[PDB]
Coordinates of all heavy atoms in Angstrom, one line a residue:
Chain E
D30 N -29.1 -7.6 4.4 CA -28.5 -7.1 5.6 C -27.2 -7.9 5.9 O -27.1 -9.1 5.7 CB -29.4 -7.2 6.8 CG -28.9 -6.4 8.0 OD1 -28.7 -5.2 7.8 OD2 -28.7 -7.0 9.0
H35 N -20.8 -3.9 6.9 CA -21.7 -2.8 7.3 C -22.9 -2.8 6.4 O -22.8 -3.3 5.3 CB -20.9 -1.4 7.1 CG -21.3 -0.4 8.1 ND1 -22.2 0.5 8.0 CD2 -20.7 -0.1 9.3 CE1 -22.3 1.3 9.0 NE2 -21.4 0.9 9.8
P36 N -24.1 -2.4 6.8 CA -25.3 -2.4 6.1 C -25.4 -1.4 4.9 O -26.2 -1.5 4.0 CB -26.4 -2.3 7.0 CG -25.8 -1.7 8.2 CD -24.4 -2.1 8.3
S37 N -24.5 -0.3 4.9 CA -24.4 0.6 3.9 C -23.5 0.2 2.7 O -23.4 0.9 1.7 CB -24.0 2.0 4.4 OG -22.8 1.8 5.2
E38 N -22.9 -1.0 2.9 CA -22.1 -1.6 1.8 C -22.9 -1.9 0.6 O -22.4 -1.9 -0.4 CB -21.4 -2.8 2.4 CG -20.4 -3.4 1.5 CD -19.1 -2.6 1.4 OE1 -19.0 -1.6 0.7 OE2 -18.1 -3.0 2.1
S40 N -25.2 0.0 -0.7 CA -25.2 1.2 -1.5 C -23.8 1.4 -2.2 O -23.8 1.8 -3.4 CB -25.5 2.4 -0.7 OG -24.7 2.4 0.5
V41 N -22.7 1.2 -1.5 CA -21.4 1.2 -2.1 C -21.3 0.2 -3.2 O -20.9 0.5 -4.3 CB -20.4 0.9 -1.0 CG1 -19.0 1.1 -1.6 CG2 -20.5 1.8 0.2
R44 N -23.3 1.4 -6.4 CA -22.4 2.3 -7.2 C -21.4 1.5 -8.0 O -21.2 1.8 -9.2 CB -21.7 3.3 -6.3 CG -20.8 4.2 -7.1 CD -19.9 5.0 -6.2 NE -18.5 4.9 -6.6 CZ -17.4 5.4 -6.0 NH1 -17.6 6.0 -4.8 NH2 -16.2 5.3 -6.5
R47 N -23.3 -0.7 -11.2 CA -23.6 0.0 -12.5 C -22.6 -0.4 -13.6 O -23.0 -0.5 -14.8 CB -23.4 1.5 -12.2 CG -24.4 2.1 -11.2 CD -24.3 3.5 -11.1 NE -24.9 4.1 -9.9 CZ -25.1 5.4 -9.7 NH1 -24.7 6.3 -10.6 NH2 -25.6 5.8 -8.6
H116 N -5.9 -7.6 4.5 CA -6.8 -6.5 5.1 C -7.6 -5.7 4.1 O -8.4 -4.9 4.4 CB -6.0 -5.6 6.0 CG -5.4 -6.2 7.2 ND1 -4.3 -7.0 7.3 CD2 -5.8 -6.1 8.5 CE1 -4.1 -7.4 8.5 NE2 -5.0 -6.8 9.2
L117 N -7.3 -6.0 2.8 CA -8.0 -5.4 1.7 C -9.5 -5.8 1.7 O -9.9 -6.9 2.0 CB -7.4 -5.7 0.3 CG -5.9 -5.4 0.1 CD1 -5.5 -5.6 -1.3 CD2 -5.6 -4.0 0.5
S118 N -10.4 -4.8 1.3 CA -11.8 -5.0 1.4 C -12.5 -4.5 0.1 O -11.9 -4.3 -0.9 CB -12.4 -4.3 2.6 OG -13.8 -4.4 2.7
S120 N -14.0 -1.7 -0.5 CA -13.7 -0.4 -0.8 C -12.5 -0.2 -1.8 O -12.6 0.7 -2.6 CB -13.4 0.4 0.5 OG -12.7 1.6 0.2
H121 N -11.6 -1.1 -1.7 CA -10.4 -1.1 -2.7 C -10.9 -1.3 -4.1 O -10.5 -0.6 -5.0 CB -9.4 -2.1 -2.3 CG -8.3 -2.3 -3.3 ND1 -7.5 -1.2 -3.7 CD2 -8.0 -3.3 -4.1 CE1 -6.7 -1.7 -4.7 NE2 -7.0 -3.0 -4.9
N123 N -14.1 -0.9 -5.2 CA -15.0 0.2 -5.6 C -14.2 1.5 -5.9 O -14.5 2.2 -6.8 CB -16.0 0.5 -4.4 CG -16.8 1.8 -4.6 OD1 -16.6 2.7 -3.9 ND2 -17.6 1.8 -5.7
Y124 N -13.1 1.7 -5.1 CA -12.3 2.8 -5.4 C -11.5 2.6 -6.7 O -11.4 3.5 -7.5 CB -11.3 3.0 -4.2 CG -10.3 4.1 -4.5 CD1 -10.9 5.3 -4.9 CD2 -9.0 3.9 -4.6 CE1 -10.1 6.2 -5.3 CE2 -8.2 4.9 -5.0 CZ -8.7 6.1 -5.3 OH -8.0 7.2 -5.7
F125 N -10.8 1.5 -6.9 CA -9.9 1.3 -7.9 C -10.6 1.3 -9.3 O -10.0 1.8 -10.3 CB -9.1 0.0 -7.7 CG -7.9 -0.1 -8.4 CD1 -6.9 0.8 -8.1 CD2 -7.7 -1.1 -9.3 CE1 -5.7 0.6 -8.8 CE2 -6.6 -1.2 -10.0 CZ -5.5 -0.3 -9.8
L126 N -11.8 0.7 -9.4 CA -12.6 0.7 -10.6 C -13.5 1.9 -10.5 O -14.8 1.7 -10.7 CB -13.3 -0.6 -10.8 CG -12.4 -1.9 -10.5 CD1 -13.1 -3.1 -10.7 CD2 -11.2 -1.8 -11.5
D127 N -13.1 3.1 -10.3 CA -13.9 4.3 -10.5 C -13.7 4.9 -11.9 O -14.6 5.6 -12.4 CB -13.5 5.3 -9.4 CG -14.5 6.5 -9.4 OD1 -15.7 6.3 -9.6 OD2 -14.0 7.6 -9.2
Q128 N -12.5 4.6 -12.5 CA -12.3 5.1 -13.8 C -13.0 4.4 -14.9 O -13.2 4.9 -16.1 CB -10.8 5.0 -14.1 CG -9.9 5.9 -13.2 CD -8.4 5.6 -13.5 OE1 -7.9 4.6 -13.1 NE2 -7.8 6.6 -14.1
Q130 N -16.2 3.5 -14.3 CA -17.5 4.1 -14.2 C -17.7 5.4 -15.0 O -18.6 6.2 -14.7 CB -17.9 4.3 -12.7 CG -17.7 3.1 -11.9 CD -18.0 3.3 -10.4 OE1 -19.2 3.6 -10.1 NE2 -17.1 3.0 -9.5
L131 N -16.7 5.6 -15.9 CA -16.8 6.7 -16.8 C -16.8 6.2 -18.2 O -17.5 6.6 -19.1 CB -15.6 7.7 -16.7 CG -15.6 8.5 -15.4 CD1 -14.4 9.4 -15.5 CD2 -16.9 9.3 -15.3
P134 N -20.5 3.6 -18.5 CA -21.8 4.3 -18.7 C -21.9 5.2 -19.9 O -22.9 5.4 -20.5 CB -21.9 5.1 -17.4 CG -21.1 4.4 -16.5 CD -19.9 4.0 -17.2
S135 N -20.7 5.7 -20.5 CA -20.7 6.5 -21.6 C -20.6 5.8 -23.0 O -20.9 6.4 -24.0 CB -19.6 7.6 -21.5 OG -18.4 6.9 -21.2
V138 N -24.5 4.2 -23.8 CA -25.5 4.9 -24.6 C -25.3 4.7 -26.1 O -26.2 4.7 -26.9 CB -25.6 6.4 -24.2 CG1 -25.7 6.5 -22.7 CG2 -24.4 7.2 -24.7
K159 N -20.0 10.7 -33.9 CA -20.6 11.7 -33.0 C -20.2 11.5 -31.5 O -20.0 12.5 -30.8 CB -22.2 11.6 -33.2 CG -23.0 12.5 -32.3 CD -24.4 12.3 -32.6 CE -25.3 12.7 -31.5 NZ -25.4 14.2 -31.4
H160 N -20.0 10.3 -31.1 CA -19.6 10.1 -29.7 C -18.1 9.9 -29.6 O -17.6 9.9 -28.4 CB -20.3 8.9 -29.2 CG -21.8 9.1 -29.0 ND1 -22.3 9.4 -27.8 CD2 -22.8 9.0 -29.9 CE1 -23.6 9.5 -27.9 NE2 -23.9 9.3 -29.2
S161 N -17.3 9.7 -30.6 CA -15.9 9.7 -30.5 C -15.3 11.1 -30.5 O -14.1 11.3 -30.2 CB -15.2 8.9 -31.7 OG -15.6 9.5 -32.9
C162 N -16.1 12.1 -30.8 CA -15.9 13.4 -30.4 C -15.6 13.5 -28.9 O -14.8 14.2 -28.4 CB -17.0 14.4 -30.8 SG -17.3 14.6 -32.5
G163 N -16.5 12.8 -28.1 CA -16.3 12.6 -26.7 C -16.6 13.9 -25.9 O -17.6 14.6 -26.1
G164 N -15.7 14.2 -25.0 CA -15.9 15.2 -24.0 C -15.3 14.8 -22.7 O -14.8 15.6 -21.9
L165 N -15.4 13.5 -22.4 CA -14.6 12.8 -21.4 C -13.6 11.8 -22.1 O -14.0 11.1 -23.0 CB -15.5 12.0 -20.4 CG -16.4 12.8 -19.5 CD1 -17.7 13.0 -20.0 CD2 -16.5 12.1 -18.1
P166 N -12.4 11.8 -21.6 CA -11.3 11.1 -22.4 C -11.5 9.6 -22.5 O -11.0 9.1 -23.5 CB -10.0 11.4 -21.4 CG -10.4 12.7 -20.8 CD -11.8 12.6 -20.5
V168 N -14.4 7.7 -23.1 CA -15.2 7.6 -24.3 C -14.7 8.4 -25.5 O -15.2 8.2 -26.6 CB -16.7 7.9 -23.8 CG1 -16.8 9.4 -23.6 CG2 -17.7 7.4 -24.8
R169 N -13.8 9.3 -25.3 CA -13.2 10.0 -26.4 C -12.1 9.2 -27.1 O -12.0 9.3 -28.3 CB -12.5 11.3 -25.9 CG -12.5 12.4 -26.9 CD -12.5 13.7 -26.1 NE -12.1 14.8 -26.9 CZ -12.3 16.1 -26.6 NH1 -12.9 16.4 -25.5 NH2 -11.9 17.1 -27.4
Chain G
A249 N -18.4 1.9 16.5 CA -19.5 1.7 15.5 C -19.8 3.1 14.8 O -20.0 3.1 13.6 CB -20.7 1.2 16.1
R252 N -17.3 3.9 12.1 CA -17.6 3.2 10.9 C -18.8 3.9 10.1 O -18.7 4.0 8.9 CB -18.0 1.7 11.2 CG -16.9 0.9 11.8 CD -15.8 0.6 10.8 NE -14.7 1.6 10.9 CZ -13.7 1.7 10.1 NH1 -13.6 0.9 9.0 NH2 -12.8 2.6 10.3
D253 N -19.8 4.3 10.8 CA -20.9 5.1 10.2 C -20.4 6.4 9.6 O -20.9 6.7 8.5 CB -22.0 5.4 11.2 CG -22.5 4.1 12.0 OD1 -22.2 3.0 11.5 OD2 -23.1 4.3 13.1
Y256 N -18.7 6.3 6.0 CA -19.5 6.3 4.8 C -20.2 7.6 4.5 O -20.5 7.8 3.3 CB -20.6 5.2 5.0 CG -20.0 3.8 5.0 CD1 -20.1 3.1 6.2 CD2 -19.4 3.3 3.9 CE1 -19.5 1.9 6.3 CE2 -18.9 2.0 4.0 CZ -19.0 1.3 5.1 OH -18.4 0.0 5.3
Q259 N -18.6 9.7 1.6 CA -19.0 9.4 0.3 C -20.4 10.1 -0.1 O -20.6 10.4 -1.3 CB -19.1 7.9 0.1 CG -17.7 7.2 0.0 CD -17.8 5.8 -0.4 OE1 -18.0 5.5 -1.5 NE2 -17.6 4.9 0.6
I261 N -23.2 8.6 1.7 CA -24.0 7.5 2.0 C -24.2 7.4 3.5 O -23.4 7.7 4.3 CB -23.2 6.2 1.5 CG1 -23.2 6.1 0.0 CG2 -23.8 4.9 2.2 CD1 -22.2 5.0 -0.5
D262 N -25.5 7.2 3.9 CA -25.9 7.1 5.3 C -25.1 6.0 6.0 O -24.6 5.0 5.4 CB -27.4 6.7 5.4 CG -28.3 7.9 5.1 OD1 -27.7 9.0 4.8 OD2 -29.5 7.8 5.2
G263 N -24.8 6.3 7.3 CA -24.0 5.3 8.1 C -24.9 4.1 8.5 O -25.4 3.4 7.7
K264 N -25.0 4.0 9.9 CA -26.1 3.0 10.4 C -26.8 3.7 11.5 O -28.1 3.6 11.5 CB -25.4 1.7 10.8 CG -26.4 0.8 11.4 CD -25.6 -0.4 12.1 CE -26.5 -1.3 12.8 NZ -27.3 -2.2 12.0
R305 N -20.8 15.6 -6.5 CA -20.9 14.2 -7.0 C -22.2 14.1 -7.9 O -22.1 13.6 -9.0 CB -20.9 13.2 -5.9 CG -21.1 11.8 -6.3 CD -19.9 11.3 -7.0 NE -20.1 10.0 -7.6 CZ -19.1 9.3 -8.3 NH1 -17.9 9.8 -8.4 NH2 -19.4 8.1 -8.7
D309 N -22.1 13.5 -12.0 CA -22.7 12.3 -12.4 C -23.6 12.5 -13.6 O -23.5 11.9 -14.7 CB -23.6 11.7 -11.3 CG -24.0 10.2 -11.6 OD1 -23.8 9.7 -12.7 OD2 -24.5 9.6 -10.6
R311 N -24.1 15.4 -15.6 CA -23.6 16.2 -16.8 C -22.6 15.4 -17.6 O -22.4 15.9 -18.8 CB -23.1 17.5 -16.4 CG -24.1 18.4 -15.7 CD -25.2 18.8 -16.7 NE -26.0 19.9 -16.1 CZ -27.1 20.3 -16.8 NH1 -27.4 19.9 -18.0 NH2 -27.9 21.3 -16.1
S312 N -22.0 14.4 -17.1 CA -21.1 13.6 -17.9 C -21.7 12.8 -19.1 O -21.1 12.6 -20.1 CB -20.3 12.6 -17.0 OG -19.9 13.3 -15.8
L313 N -23.0 12.5 -19.0 CA -23.7 11.8 -20.0 C -24.4 12.7 -21.0 O -24.9 12.2 -22.0 CB -24.8 10.9 -19.4 CG -24.4 10.1 -18.1 CD1 -25.7 9.4 -17.5 CD2 -23.3 9.0 -18.5
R315 N -24.7 15.4 -24.0 CA -24.1 16.1 -25.2 C -24.9 17.3 -25.5 O -24.4 18.1 -26.3 CB -24.1 15.1 -26.4 CG -23.6 13.7 -26.1 CD -23.1 13.1 -27.3 NE -22.1 13.8 -28.0 CZ -20.7 13.6 -27.9 NH1 -20.3 12.6 -27.1 NH2 -19.9 14.4 -28.5
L319 N -19.4 19.4 -25.4 CA -18.0 18.9 -25.1 C -17.3 19.6 -24.0 O -16.7 19.0 -23.1 CB -17.1 18.9 -26.3 CG -17.3 17.9 -27.5 CD1 -18.6 17.9 -28.3 CD2 -16.0 18.1 -28.5
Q322 N -18.5 18.6 -20.4 CA -18.0 17.3 -20.2 C -16.5 17.2 -19.9 O -16.1 16.4 -19.1 CB -18.2 16.5 -21.5 CG -19.7 16.1 -21.7 CD -19.9 15.3 -23.0 OE1 -20.0 15.8 -24.1 NE2 -19.9 14.0 -22.8
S323 N -15.8 18.1 -20.5 CA -14.3 18.3 -20.1 C -14.2 18.8 -18.7 O -13.2 18.5 -18.0 CB -13.6 19.2 -21.0 OG -12.2 19.1 -20.9
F324 N -15.2 19.6 -18.2 CA -15.3 20.0 -16.8 C -15.7 18.8 -15.9 O -15.1 18.6 -14.8 CB -16.3 21.1 -16.7 CG -16.6 21.6 -15.3 CD1 -15.7 21.8 -14.4 CD2 -18.0 21.9 -15.0 CE1 -16.0 22.3 -13.1 CE2 -18.3 22.4 -13.7 CZ -17.3 22.6 -12.8
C325 N -16.5 17.9 -16.4 CA -17.0 16.7 -15.7 C -15.8 15.7 -15.5 O -15.8 15.1 -14.4 CB -18.1 16.0 -16.4 SG -19.7 16.7 -16.2
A326 N -15.0 15.6 -16.5 CA -13.8 14.8 -16.4 C -12.9 15.3 -15.2 O -12.4 14.5 -14.4 CB -12.9 14.9 -17.7
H329 N -14.8 14.5 -11.7 CA -14.7 13.1 -11.3 C -13.3 12.7 -11.0 O -13.1 11.9 -10.1 CB -15.3 12.3 -12.4 CG -16.0 11.1 -12.0 ND1 -15.3 10.0 -11.5 CD2 -17.4 10.8 -11.9 CE1 -16.3 9.0 -11.2 NE2 -17.5 9.5 -11.4
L332 N -12.7 13.7 -7.6 CA -13.5 12.9 -6.6 C -12.8 11.5 -6.3 O -12.9 11.0 -5.1 CB -14.9 12.6 -7.1 CG -15.8 13.8 -7.0 CD1 -17.0 13.6 -7.8 CD2 -16.1 14.2 -5.6
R333 N -12.1 10.9 -7.3 CA -11.4 9.7 -7.1 C -10.3 9.9 -6.0 O -10.3 9.2 -5.0 CB -10.8 9.2 -8.4 CG -10.3 7.8 -8.4 CD -9.5 7.3 -9.7 NE -9.3 5.9 -9.7 CZ -8.1 5.3 -9.3 NH1 -7.1 6.1 -8.8 NH2 -8.0 4.0 -9.3
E334 N -9.5 10.9 -6.1 CA -8.4 11.3 -5.2 C -8.9 11.5 -3.8 O -8.2 11.1 -2.8 CB -7.7 12.5 -5.7 CG -7.2 12.4 -7.2 CD -6.9 13.8 -7.8 OE1 -6.8 14.8 -7.1 OE2 -6.7 13.9 -9.0
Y335 N -10.2 11.9 -3.7 CA -10.8 12.0 -2.4 C -11.1 10.6 -1.8 O -11.1 10.4 -0.6 CB -12.1 12.9 -2.4 CG -12.8 13.0 -1.1 CD1 -12.1 13.6 0.0 CD2 -14.0 12.5 -0.9 CE1 -12.7 13.7 1.2 CE2 -14.6 12.6 0.4 CZ -14.0 13.2 1.4 OH -14.6 13.3 2.7
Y336 N -11.6 9.7 -2.7 CA -12.0 8.4 -2.1 C -10.8 7.5 -1.7 O -10.9 6.5 -1.0 CB -12.7 7.5 -3.1 CG -14.0 8.2 -3.7 CD1 -14.3 8.1 -5.0 CD2 -14.9 9.0 -2.9 CE1 -15.4 8.7 -5.6 CE2 -16.0 9.6 -3.5 CZ -16.2 9.4 -4.9 OH -17.2 9.9 -5.6
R337 N -9.5 7.9 -2.2 CA -8.3 7.1 -1.9 C -8.1 7.1 -0.4 O -7.8 6.0 0.2 CB -7.1 7.7 -2.6 CG -5.8 7.0 -2.2 CD -4.6 7.4 -2.9 NE -4.8 7.4 -4.4 CZ -4.7 8.5 -5.1 NH1 -4.5 9.7 -4.6 NH2 -4.9 8.4 -6.4
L339 N -10.2 7.6 1.9 CA -11.3 6.8 2.6 C -11.1 5.3 2.6 O -11.3 4.7 3.6 CB -12.6 7.1 1.9 CG -13.1 8.6 1.6 CD1 -14.4 8.7 1.1 CD2 -13.0 9.4 2.9
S340 N -10.6 4.8 1.5 CA -10.2 3.4 1.4 C -9.1 3.1 2.4 O -9.2 2.0 3.1 CB -9.8 3.1 0.0 OG -10.8 2.9 -0.9
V341 N -8.1 3.9 2.6 CA -7.1 3.7 3.5 C -7.7 3.6 5.0 O -7.3 2.8 5.7 CB -6.0 4.8 3.4 CG1 -5.0 4.7 4.6 CG2 -5.3 4.6 2.1
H343 N -10.7 2.9 5.8 CA -11.5 1.6 5.9 C -10.7 0.5 6.4 O -11.0 -0.2 7.3 CB -12.2 1.3 4.6 CG -13.5 2.0 4.3 ND1 -14.6 1.8 5.0 CD2 -13.8 3.0 3.4 CE1 -15.6 2.5 4.6 NE2 -15.1 3.3 3.6
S344 N -9.6 0.3 5.7 CA -8.7 -0.9 6.0 C -8.0 -0.8 7.3 O -7.6 -1.8 7.9 CB -7.8 -1.1 4.8 OG -6.9 0.0 4.7
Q347 N -9.6 -3.0 11.5 CA -10.1 -4.3 11.3 C -10.0 -5.2 12.5 O -10.9 -5.3 13.3 CB -9.4 -5.0 10.1 CG -10.0 -6.4 9.7 CD -11.4 -6.3 9.4 OE1 -12.3 -6.8 10.3 NE2 -11.8 -5.8 8.3
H424 N -9.2 22.5 -23.6 CA -8.7 21.6 -24.7 C -9.6 21.6 -25.9 O -9.1 21.7 -27.1 CB -8.3 20.3 -24.1 CG -7.9 19.2 -25.2 ND1 -6.6 19.0 -25.5 CD2 -8.6 18.5 -26.0 CE1 -6.5 18.1 -26.4 NE2 -7.8 17.8 -26.8

Side-chain angles (χ1 to χ4, degrees):
Chain E
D30 192 59
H35 214 271
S37 50
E38 191 75 280
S40 48
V41 185
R44 180 192 131 188
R47 301 183 196 190
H116 292 78
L117 302 184
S118 178
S120 157
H121 169 63
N123 174 245
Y124 174 58
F125 199 64
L126 313 179
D127 187 39
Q128 298 174 286
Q130 307 182 58
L131 292 183
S135 50
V138 309
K159 178 174 157 75
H160 292 261
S161 56
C162 299
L165 290 91
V168 73
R169 211 152 162 163
Chain G
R252 296 293 92 192
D253 307 344
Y256 293 110
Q259 289 189 70
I261 289 170
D262 285 1
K264 176 192 172 78
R305 178 69 188 185
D309 196 350
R311 296 292 189 186
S312 315
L313 317 172
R315 314 203 56 99
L319 281 66
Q322 287 180 275
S323 196
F324 176 41
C325 278
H329 213 286
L332 288 168
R333 198 191 185 262
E334 307 163 12
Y335 181 63
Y336 308 136
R337 176 178 305 120
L339 309 186
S340 278
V341 171
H343 277 292
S344 60
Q347 186 51 256
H424 175 95

